[PDB]
């Protein structure tokens, strides 16, 4: 995860660059900071980056639910037995489980 990507066409003293990096990270976090404005001097630019592979792409939940239903399918247990059911689910589904499986 990245908050900012600042690049400069000139070399700016890795030790002090890293100190400023830490200061600027801690200063601009509302939990631990009291600043929200950047005045970049000397020609330093801020690259308008974007997240490459977001977590929203990995929509595994439907696949995981399918694998769970398939796993419960082989043994025979109805899916309502594992979850909660109404008056119209619990005893009919328990009867199916016992009898049929």
């Amino acid at each position: 995860v990245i908050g900012l990507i600042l690049e400069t066409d000139e070399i700016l003293n890795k030790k002090l660059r890293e100190r400023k990096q830490e200061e600027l990270q801690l200063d601009y976090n509302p939990s631990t900071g009291q600043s929200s404005v950047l005045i970049l001097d000397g020609g330093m630019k801020a690259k308008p980056y974007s997240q490459i592979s977001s977590f929203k792409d990995l929509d595994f939940k439907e696949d995981i639910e399918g694998f769970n239903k398939s796993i419960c399918l082989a043994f025979g247990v109805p899916q309502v037995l594992l979850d909660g059911g109404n008056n119209a689910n619990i005893r009919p589904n328990i009867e199916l489980f016992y009898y049929m499986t």
Binding site: N13, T32, G43
Partner: protein, 170 residues
Amino acid sequence: MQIITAEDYRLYGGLKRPELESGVEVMITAANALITSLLGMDDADAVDQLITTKPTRKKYFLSSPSATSVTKMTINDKEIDPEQYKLYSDGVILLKFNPPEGYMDVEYTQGGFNPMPEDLKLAACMLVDHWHKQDYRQARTIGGETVTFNNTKSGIPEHIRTIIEVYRRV
């Protein structure tokens, strides 16, 4: 600070006249002031600064990364003994305890470049040479032998610019 002075400017060149020219005497001091103001330094024995403080933040950064020691520390008008905070190599100061929310007042002593780096000496010498012979133009022709000058970033030429940017955070 005091980076060059007449002796080092003379050593940079091969000047034979015992007395420096009229234009260079003020030019040296202007170069020293401009270098120390570009880098962010301010020549001062001690500095007072109001750092905002929030809980769950146990490191606060001083303005000058060349801070020697903290004379006294204050959070909402109550001094804290030097045992609770420790100042590290850079301007970072770390607090052993968890500071209460409010405002922080620290008075530290600034010590900057006691061994003076030679890069800054060369950069200031190049600025004063850049100003003495009036070479801030895009190009200049003298009869047949002409010169076109280097690109300028933020006014100052490229070489002085790169030296400054190497040292432009103290």
